[PDB]
Amino acid sequence: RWAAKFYGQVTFGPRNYP
Amino acid sequence: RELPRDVKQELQSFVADAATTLESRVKYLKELDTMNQRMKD
Amino acid sequence: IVAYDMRVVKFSPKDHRQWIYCV
Amino acid sequence: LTPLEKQEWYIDEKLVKSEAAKVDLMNELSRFELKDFD
Amino acid sequence: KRSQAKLRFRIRQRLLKFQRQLAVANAIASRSVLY
RNA sequence: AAUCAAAAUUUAUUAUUUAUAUUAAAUAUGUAUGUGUAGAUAAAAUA
RNA sequence: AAAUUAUAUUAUAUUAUA
Numbered sequence: 001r002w003a004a005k006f007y008g009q010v011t012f013g014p015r016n017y018p
Numbered sequence: 019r020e021l022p023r024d025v026k027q028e029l030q031s032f033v034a035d036a037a038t039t040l041e042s043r044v045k046y047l048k049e050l051d052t053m054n055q056r057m058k059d
Numbered sequence: 060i061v062a063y064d065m066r067v068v069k070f071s072p073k074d075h076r077q078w079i080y081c082v
Numbered sequence: 083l084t085p086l087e088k089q090e091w092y093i094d095e096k097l098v099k100s101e102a103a104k105v106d107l108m109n110e111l112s113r114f115e116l117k118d119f120d
Numbered sequence: 121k122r123s124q125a126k127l128r129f130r131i132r133q134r135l136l137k138f139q140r141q142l143a144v145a146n147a148i149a150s151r152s153v154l155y
Numbered sequence: 156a157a158u159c160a161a162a163a164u165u166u167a168u169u170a171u172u173u174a175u176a177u178u179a180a181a182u183a184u185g186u187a188u189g190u191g192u193a194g195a196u197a198a199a200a201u202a
Numbered sequence: 203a204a205a206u207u208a209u210a211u212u213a214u215a216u217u218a219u220a
Contacts, residue, residue: 001120003050003140003144003145004140007143010144010147010152010153011153011154013152014143014152016143017142017143017146018142018143020201021201026201036190037190039120042119042120043120046119047145050141051145051148051149052114053116054142054146061090062090063091066123067105067127068123069126072112073112073113074109075127077098077101108127112131112134116138116141
């Protein structure tokens with residue numbers, strides 16, 4: 001679950017990539 | 019009675035191996051990058 | 060021969076093949 | 083393109099190989115492992 | 121044509137289950153992560 | 156494909172280390188946790 | 203949340219400070 005922590009730090013542009 | 023959650027996560031951060039965790043997370047990031055690159059073509 | 064078709068069969072979550080359906 | 087392909091009782095084998103290669107591309111996308119294990 | 125739609129549904133479900141990991145991988149690849 | 160003495164290689168001096176053993180005081184209050192390096196290998200269930 | 207893959211055993215370390 002270490003990769004799900006940084007999802008709150010992604011810019012709103014590439015948050016919906018797939 | 020089992021341990022509470024926060025002391026269990028802090029103990030797992032305290033006593034586990036650092037190099038194995040680093041290698042597994044870096045190869046996981048590499049595998050995700052190869053998946054993203056395979057999706058981009 | 061009534062109809063030819065291409066169906067996608069699933070043998071596993073990692074295994075999807077394509078067969079030729081025929082009526 | 084040809085009107086012979088518009089009928090359902092005739093198949094284009096090259097189109098079958100193209101879409102089967104597309105299914106193999108979906109298979110190679112399905113080979114990956116995305117669980118975190120952390 | 122519905123079997124290919126089921127295949128696309130399975131691919132979309134697998135991609136939307138792990139959308140956060142692919143998003144953070146693309147964010148590290150595109151250098152867009154707020155520290 | 157156009158060469159030649161790093162430690163081919165030997166020896167020595169205020170001086171550079173890591174180790175070798177030497178190596179001690181201190182209760183006025185508050186106190187000090189690593190990775191590794193090693194030898195032969197004869198316990199095991201919070202995920 | 204089971205099956206156990208798990209080696210496990212004991213000891214050491216630094217300008218105390220020269």
